[PDB]
Every structure is written in C-alpha cells, then in structure tokens.
C-alpha cells in the first residue's frame, strides 16, 4: 500500500524498530471491534511478519508477529488465506516447541483460527504435522496455554464433510481423556466438544473413545454445574450409544440412565431434546436395554415431554417411546408398562402436528401397541382389544385415520391397515 518507515522500519535491520513497528500493527489488529485487516494486508507486511516467526528471531518479536498474524487469520476466509499463502502455518507449528510459553499461546491461537476456517485448512494444518507439537503443549502447566490448545484441538476434530484424518486426530484421545478431569471450565467445554466430534462416526471411532476410559467421566460431567459442559458431554454420550449394543451397554454400566433422567428436566431446551435423543438411541437397543430404561424410571418424564414440550423435543421423546414399543413383541410387559404410563394419547395427539417422518414413527409405535393387544386377547381368549379401546377412548382413532388424507403414499397404508385390522 502506502506505509514508509513503518514498513521500511519493519524491513529495517534494527531489531528494536522492527519490534516497535510490529507492536503497532498488533495493536491495530487487536480488534476492539471490526479491525482494518484488509489495509494491513494490502500494505504488504504479511510476508515480513512471517519472517519474524523464524526459529532464532527475538522472542518478543516472534510473539508480537504471531499475535498480529493471529488476528489477520481470525478475519474472513480470504484474509485467512493470505496468512496461509505466506507459508505461516509451518512456522506456527515450529513455535509450538521452540518458542517460550508466551510465544506458544500466540502460535496455537493462530492455528486455531486457520483450522477453524474450513475443512481444507483444517486438513492442511494436520498435513503439516501439527498434531505432535500440539499434543506436546499439554505437557505444560500454564492454564491459559492448555485452554487455547484445547480449543485449537477441538477445531482440528470438528467437521464431517469431509471428516479429518482419523489416523491423526485419534492420537489426541489419550490427551482428551485427561483434559476432561480439568478444573478449568473452558478447558472442559472444548475438550468435551472435541470428544463429541471424534465419537461421531463408525463403531471403530466409538470404540476408540471407549477404550481410553472416557465414557465414565462423560457421565459424571452430565451433572456438571455448567450447561456449557453438560451439552457437549451429552452430545458425546449420545454419539457413543449410536454404536452397537455392547458399546451402548458400556454407557449404561457407567450410570448414564439416572443422569439422563435429571437432564430431562434441564432449563436448556436443547439439553432436554438431546437427552431424549440419547435415550431413544438406548431404547433402540435390545430387550434388556429397553428394560433398563424402564427400570430407571425414564418413561414417565418422557411421556410428559411427549405432550407438553416443544416439538423439537417432543419428536425425540416420540422416537424413544416408539423404539421401546417395538420391544414389546419379545416382552409384552414393556407395552403394558408403556400403556399404563399413559403414552397412547400423547402419541395420537402428535399425529396432527408432526412431520411426515415423525407421524410414521408414531404410527409404528401405535401399531406395536395394537399388535400386542391382539396377541394377548387371542392367547387369553378375549373378544375386545383394550389397547384398541384405549386409542379410541383417547380420541386418537380418528387422528389415526386423519393421516390418510396426507399425500405421502406411505403414511397411507399403515394408517388404514391399522383401521382395517383393529377398527
């Protein structure tokens, strides 16, 4: 752009006026708000700032330069691109083990901004072998360094399309297993988010989270004083129970069911929602796991949410109950319990406000309840299905056949099959 003698003194060989200029740029880029990154970029000072991060540059020069480049990288994607194109990332990484503690926090912050920009830059940071120096930071004690490193670590684990290199990010699991025992709240939060990202994938990824003894602590963190800790911990727990029955049983054995019960009455609506989603994944298991959910007294608050909670939460409670109802074939007492807890009317009432998908989910639940009813009255020699009466007395029999008006060709068959078979 324009600057002399602030760019020239930046290009000076005098180490003092090199620092004085860099500090000026840093103070400018440290946005109270809204900071003039573009005019700093077009001033052509970025490549020089990158030079100041070289191995044997003065410490305070490395610090101020990395700080300045950090804020430039915190801007738009195009502004972050400028830092990347200046080959600054490999120097950020080198400072993670060469620089002092203060310099390390600057560098790891910058890498967080770069990795948080896109999946491309996230992968690029990983391709530059950043993981090993980053994991080395957690050998340090300074809380502020640990806090920032954990944040950057979560940024490297985040993203699904595409997901990061598993062979790389999975190396952070033993470190994350320790980080969730931290006394620092913000460190806890980001560590739990990082785990939720890693636990989101195939059974191999889930098993890796299990093998480092993480689930036990996650369940304990569900009762943390802060909802900022509970939410990512719940997300991670919810991800693990998306695996097979064995992996789901581990979470149950860690005492997740009583914890989930308390979360059903959480002030945060989305915590309620994902608690129901988690339970629904567990009720989605085998007979004994559905029974465990029942024995943990989870159904009554679920039924209560199925009728009075917001739709996004209500639809998740539907999944939980609808799943559990499927189990009623192998154990009819499951259906008997569900019906006795008054689930039929909230299910039926949901049919007239739900999505095309949730209605289909609800219809399967009601069908499982009905199918159990006929199986029982046939084996006991009765003339009337009381579950069919319960539905009719709840006024849902009509709602069942107010769903064939619906133009989806398969909300259509079950709806009238129910009416044709039971009514």
């Amino acid at each position: 752009a324009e600057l002399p003698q602030m760019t020239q003194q930046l290009n000076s060989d005098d180490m003092q006026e090199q620092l004085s200029a860099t500090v000026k740029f840093r103070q400018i880029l440290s946005r109270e708000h809204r900071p003039p990154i573009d005019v700093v970029i077009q001033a052509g000072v970025v490549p020089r700032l990158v030079e100041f991060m070289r191995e044997n540059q003065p410490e305070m020069l490395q610090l101020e330069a990395a700080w300045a480049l950090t804020n430039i990288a915190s801007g738009t994607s195009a502004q972050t691109k400028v830092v990347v194109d200046a080959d600054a990332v490999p120097l950020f990484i080198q400072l993670l083990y060469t620089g002092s503690v203060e310099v390390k926090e600057q560098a790891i912050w910058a890498l967080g901004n770069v990795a948080g920009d896109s999946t491309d830059y996230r992968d690029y940071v990983l391709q530059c072998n950043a993981m090993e120096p980053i994991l080395g930071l957690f050998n340090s004690n300074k809380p502020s360094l640990i806090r920032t490193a954990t944040w950057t670590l979560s940024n490297l684990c985040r993203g699904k399309k595409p997901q990061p290199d598993w062979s790389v990010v999975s190396q952070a699991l033993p470190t994350l297993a320790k980080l969730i025992y931290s006394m620092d709240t913000e460190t806890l939060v980001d560590a739990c988010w990082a785990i939720s990202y890693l636990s989101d994938g195939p059974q191999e990824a889930i098993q890796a989270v299990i093998d480092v003894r993480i689930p036990k602590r996650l369940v304990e963190l569900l009762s943390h004083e802060s909802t900022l800790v509970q939410t990512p911990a719940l997300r991670a727990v919810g991800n693990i129970v998306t695996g097979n029955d064995l992996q789901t049983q581990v979470v149950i054995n860690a005492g997740v069911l009583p914890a989930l019960r308390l979360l059903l009455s959480s002030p945060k609506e989305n915590i309620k929602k994902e608690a129901c989603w988690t339970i629904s994944n567990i009720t989605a298991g085998n007979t004994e796991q559905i029974q465990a959910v029942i024995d943990a007294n989870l159904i009554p608050p679920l039924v209560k949410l199925l009728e009075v909670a917001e739709y996004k939460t209500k639809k998740e409670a539907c999944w939980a109950i609808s799943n559990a109802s499927s189990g009623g074939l192998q154990r009819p007492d499951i259906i008997r319990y569900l019906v006795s807890q008054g689930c039929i009317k909230p299910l039926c009432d949901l049919l007239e406000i739900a999505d095309n998908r949730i209605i289909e989910v609800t219809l399967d639940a009601l069908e499982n309840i009905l199918k159990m009813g006929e199986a029982d009255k046939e084996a006991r020699g009765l003339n009337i299905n009381e579950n069919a009466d319960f539905i009719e007395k709840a006024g849902g029999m009509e709602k069942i056949f107010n769903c064939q008006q619906n133009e989806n060709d398969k909300i259509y068959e079950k709806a009238y099959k129910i009416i044709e078979t039971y009514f």
């Binding site: 804020n71 915190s74 985040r158 994902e274 989603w277 998740e316 559990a324």
Partner: peptide, 18 residues
C-alpha cells in the same frame, strides 16, 4: 428396535485482544 440415529433429527474463529 429400529435405529440408530447418528444425529438428532464451539466457536470457529477467535480474536486475541488479551
């Protein structure tokens, strides 16, 4: 039962103001 659902139906960039 019938499932599982991987999904139910943090802060990308930060500035250093010290």
């Amino acid at each position: 039962t019938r499932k599982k659902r991987k999904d139910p139906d943090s802060n990308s960039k930060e500035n250093k103001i010290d």
